[PDB]
Amino acid sequence: LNYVAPKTRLEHEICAIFSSILNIETVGVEDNFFEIGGTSLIASKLIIELLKQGYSVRYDDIFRNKTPRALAKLLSGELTDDIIKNYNYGEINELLQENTWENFFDGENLELGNVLLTGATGFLGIHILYEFIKSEEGKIYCMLRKGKFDSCQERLIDVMNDYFDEDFTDLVGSRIIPIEGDITEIDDFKQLEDEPIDTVINSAALVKHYTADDYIFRVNVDGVINGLKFAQTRNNIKYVQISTISVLSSYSLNEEAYPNQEYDERTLYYEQDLENKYVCSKFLAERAVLQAATKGLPVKIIRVGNLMSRYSDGVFQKNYDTNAFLNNIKTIKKLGAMNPAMASEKVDMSQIDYVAKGILALSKTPEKSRVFHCMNNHYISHRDIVDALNTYGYGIEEVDFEEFKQIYEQNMNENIQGIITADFSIDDFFEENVEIEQTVDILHSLGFDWPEADEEYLKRLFDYLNKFDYFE
């Protein structure tokens, strides 16, 4: 064992908290929270307990400082960045400059053809498969692991029936081709090299905002590199990467070096804050995709936003409990209050069926149209959301900052888990400058407008979650 006795009284307190939270007889000062039985959700209880003792910490602190020794150095005052900065972005930026309304409008659209879809079992991927079945003519190969099933074919069929009213089982074997595979193993791509594949759509991703190890980089970066290598083995395979709008994460940390910076579909790197592991992995994937483009691969990067329930019927993902936006809303409901900054925060409600439709449409844009901001441009505020929630009788109120604090102080328990796992800190009290209009315009030219996230849609959404007593 690495058992080291704590020295200072602060270290003793943090060791004792670890041991009480995890129910471990003896915890040393160099015990890794996540190695000794801690999980990401128990980390939020850890944070709540440290806040109850009057320490100033937030959720990412326990991921960056995993032992009581490190946590005490933090609370008392004592390679990805190099990968990001050690790069010549000239050629990528030159390609980005071609991504204009003019080149979309003047260019020749590309054919989708037969699709290799990764991530078909996740929330986005299943709906891409749904829309492909419903609106496209070709074949779709879906790469997935067998999981708890006898075959990946049975697993895909089960997920399809989980999410759809229609039974599209009878298309499995004709339009839908299940492929046993894992994007993190490059050899799993070899079995596809003799298949008529025209477009790869890479929606497989690990979308945890905070993780204790580097598997997120294996799925989100190495898997993209492997898919790009597969695409490069032929001269006619488009590679469409599903990305996140969050790569435009902040104002430049070095404004002197990036003056008059815009944050649009022609922007990749401007020394924005890339410390978060998920944003960082997606950024590195984008850079790999555009690099391959500088070598001649046809590519698209489709940045998506706040992936929400279907417009048609309000159905959300199977693992409804893990969404950060919704858990923040849950906390607001539990406290029955939000302060004015919270109330005013705008959000896209990108309905997953329309996200998938928009991905399929943008995949057909001309070769120079490389990067899109595919999210619902009719932003709502948390007053809109709370107006919808209060029709259930929850009585949620917009309160002033001081009152919100009093209510927050009085709820140092499970009720604030939501905002805690979203890296909230009561002291925390740019995105308005992200532009998406070009993509709006292009989508409109393609026949696509976003449906408004009106009260009825929000009620559909909340009705679905209420079937699980989500707010209970």
Spatial CA neighbour of 156 closest among 176, 183, 186:
176
Q: Are 305 and 299 in contact (CB under 8 A)?
A: no
H, E, C per residue of 370-398: CEEEECCCCCEEHHHHHHHHHHHCCCCEE
The answer to whether 299 and 227 have CB atoms below 8 angstroms apart is no
**CA distances, 125 to each of 121, 160, 311, 408, 458 (Å):** 6, 11, 16, 37, 23
CB 366 within 8 A of CB 138: no
Q: Please, are residues 293 and 299 in contact by the beta-carbon 8 Å criterion?
A: yes
Q: Is 279 annotated as a binding residue?
A: no
Is 220 in contact with 278 (CB distance < 8 Å)? yes
- CB-based contacts of 18: which residues, under 8 Å, 6+ apart? 24, 27, 31, 33, 36, 38, 46, 68
Cα–Cα dist 267/464, whole Å: 37
- The span from the CA of 312 to the CA of 400, in Å, is 36
Cβ atoms < 10 Å from Cβ of 373: 27
Closest CA to 97 of 109, 89, 88, 87: 89
- Whole-number Å distance between alpha carbons of 341 and 421: 18
Alpha-carbon distance values, 18 to 40, 59, 68, 308 (Å): 13, 15, 8, 35
Contact 418, 321 (CB under 8 A): no
The torsion defined by the Cα of 383, 386, 390 and 391, in degrees rounded to 10, comes to 80
**Cα(468)–Cα(27) distance, rounded to whole angstroms?**
37
Where are the chain's structural domains? 1-79, 79-472
* Whole-angstrom distance, CA of residue 111 vs CA of residue 199: 9
Q: Are 272 and 250 in contact (CB under 8 A)?
A: yes
CA atoms of 328 and 417, how far apart (whole Å): 8
> Do 363 and 201 touch, CB atoms closer than 8 A?
yes
434 labelled ligand-binding:
no
300 annotated as a binding-site residue: no
What's the burial of 296, exposed, middle or buried (CB within 10 Å: 0-12/13-18/19+)?
Answer: exposed
**Cα 114 off chain centre by:** 26
- Which ranges constitute the DSSP H helices of 120-235? 123-135, 152-163, 187-190, 215-217, 223-232
Q: Which two tokens stand for residue 89?
A: 């972005």
Query: Terminal CA-to-CA distance of the chain, rounded, Å?
Result: 42
- 244 annotated to a ligand binding site: no
> How far is 243 from 358, CA to CA, in rounded Å?
13
Give φ, ψ of 82 to 5 degrees: -65, -45
Percent helix / strand / coil, the chain, rounded to 5: 45, 10, 45
Q: Tokens for 8?
A: 């200072």
Phi–psi pair at 371, nearest 5 degrees: -135, 135
Total residues belonging to the chain: 472
Tell whether residue 208 is among the known ligand binding residues.
yes
Q: Put residue 101 in one of left, alpha, beta given phi > 0 → left and psi -120 to 50 → alpha.
A: alpha
Question: Does 40 show up as a binding residue in the annotation?
Answer: yes
Instruction: Give the technique used to solve this structure.
Output: X-ray
> Coil, strand or helix: which one is 64?
helix
Say if CB 29 and CB 95 are below 8 A apart: no
Question: What was the resolution (in A) of this experimentally determined structure?
Answer: 2.0
**Beta strands in 266-345, from DSSP E residues, in sequence order:** 299-304, 307-308, 337-338
For residues 93 and 294, give the distance between their C-alpha atoms in angstroms, rounded to a whole number: 10
Task: State how far Cα 127 lies from the chain centre.
Answer: 16
Give the side-chain half-sphere CA count within 13 A for 443: 24
Breaks (C-N over 2.5 A) in the chain follow: 78, 429
For 16-42, b/e burial (b = at least 16 CB within 10 A) is: ebbbebbeeeebbbbbebbeeebebeb
**How many angstroms separate the Cα of 386 from the Cα of each of 283, 341, 454, 455?**
33, 14, 12, 10
Q: Report the C-alpha gap between 239 and 123 in whole angstroms.
A: 20
Please report which residue ranges of 397-466 form alpha helices under DSSP H.
401-409, 417-421, 437-445, 455-466
Rounded-to-10 torsion of CA 164, 167, 169, 175: -80
Nearest-angstrom CA–CA distance, 238 and 84: 25
For 91, 94, 265, 370, the CA distances from 97, given in Å and listed in that order, are: 10, 5, 9, 10
Instruction: Name the token pair of 450.
Output: 């976003």
Separation of alpha carbons 166 and 129, rounded Å? 13
